[model samples]
Each structure stands twice: as structure tokens, then as C-alpha cells.
Target: DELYRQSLEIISRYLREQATGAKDSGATSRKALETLRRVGDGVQRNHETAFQGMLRKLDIKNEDDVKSLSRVMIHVFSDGVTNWGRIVTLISFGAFVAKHLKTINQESCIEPLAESITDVLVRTKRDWLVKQRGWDGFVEFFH
Candidate 1:
């Protein structure tokens, strides 16, 4: 826990230093914002129950849709303090999108690796019991 907290703080510090740099502002903003669009897509897809109404109201069919939403939100907040959740959502979206597009960041293979192992274990165990015991037993075991 300490290591995770410590390293994450280092990352937060690094991003803060990079945030207002005079150089790379143009492309950096676009890249960060583009990555944000992808994050919107991912969340809307994965958490359909949570975002279904919101996505439908936004009419978020593609990149341009999300771009439009992000633009208005930024213009309003650029000079005004808005809901705290709004800015938190913006930053959290960046976190989800950072390693997604092969961006300038560290990559971790742990998720896929762990996922594969869990998948195989479930498949093997369930498949074997289902084969040996039939539908009734499979349902009983899983249930």
C-alpha cells in the first residue's frame, strides 16, 4: 500500500509539472482530450446501467459527440467554479485513458495476464464439473 501510494504521488507530481508547460500545450491538450474521448467510450460501454441515460442525453455516438460535450463543459468552467464532481470526472477520465492509446506513459501487462489466468481456471473447473455432472450439477455448483 505504501509503495502504491508513494509511486502514485510521484506520478501526480510529474503530471502537475507537465500540465502548464508553455511548450507542447497545443498537441498535449489535443492528445489528452482525445484520450478523454476514448475514456468516455470505454466507461459508457462497460457500465451501461450507470451511463445509459447520460450517454443517450448527450447523444454520444462517436468522437465528435464527446468532443462537443467536453468543449461546452470546459468553456463554462474556464472562468467559473462548477460542481466538484465535474472536474473529478475529467481527471478520472484521463487516468483511464492514459495507457489506453499507446500514449507517452508506462504500460502494465498485469491486467491481461491476471485475466487470462482467472479465465482459464474458471473454464477448466466449470467445464470439467459440467461434463461430469451434467446441467443440474453445474447449476447447483455455480449457484
Candidate 2:
């Protein structure tokens, strides 16, 4: 969990600096940043409307609302999974949710929300992830 958070922080920080990718992080951290940044870019460029539609109805005002919405996102992730594409959608969707929270001034929910995303993925795809060597496999597979 801490590593995921660390990876997220690096990605967000470097991404804010407009760097497409970086090589200074650890293997897992680099992999996570690459995977999330790639998915995040695609989501922002092409699927912005579709991803927004998924969260359009969510009126997230507090932690409880985050819990409710996390369930919805989890369901969406479960409904669509098989390859890296599905995994990309999950994290990309979470990024959209994070943006929405930022817009609504619920920025405090981001971390816990991130954990929810990680939890679902870890719980459902731990073995698959391990086989892929965590997100390292995601980068190699996509590129």
C-alpha cells in the first residue's frame, strides 16, 4: 500500500511537471508510473466523456459517499477484466474519480479512494499481478 502511494506520488508529481516518463524510480515504481501515466493520458484524451459519464451521477460529498462510489467502481472493474486493457480502465477510471473529488473539494478522499482501487485489484488479481511481476508486466505487455 505504501509503495503504491509512493508510486502514485511520484507519478503525480512528475506528471504535474509534464514529464511523460521518468527512469529514476525503482522497478515497481517506474512500472506503476508508466502504466498509470499511459492509461491516464489515454483516458484524458479519448475516454474523457465516457469516464465522466461513469461518475456523473456520483454525488460524493464525504467519506461515506466515497465508500458507496468505491463499490460502484469495484463493480465496474469486476464487470470488465481479462487483460491489461481492463486493468487500465480500472486505474484510469480511478484517476477520473480522483479528479472529480478534487473538483468538488473532496480532495481528502483521494488516498482512501486509491486504496480501494488497490484493494480490489489486489484482492481480485493478486495471482495474475504476481505472474506479471506486478505492474512491471503491464508496461512490457502494453509496449
Give lDDT per model, in order. Answer: 0.35, 0.65
For model 2, state the Cα shift of residue 130 in Å. 1.3
Task: Compose the digit string of candidate 1's lDDT tens values, residues 1-143.
Answer: 33223223322322332232222233333443344344444553565554445434654333334334544444533445433233334333333332231232322322232232223223333444235342233223323
Candidate 1 regions exceeding 4 Å error are 1-51, 79-85, 92-143
Superposition error at 31 for model 2 (Å): 3.4
Which candidate ranks first by lDDT, i.e. highest?
Answer: 2
Give RMSD (Å) of candidate 2 vs. truth. Answer: 4.3
In model 2, residue pairs whose N, Cα or C atoms come closer than 3 Å (at least 3 residues apart or on different chains), thus clashing, are none
Q: Which 10 successive residues of model 1 have the least lDDT summed?
A: 109-118
Top model by TM-score, which number? 2
TM-score of each: 0.25, 0.76
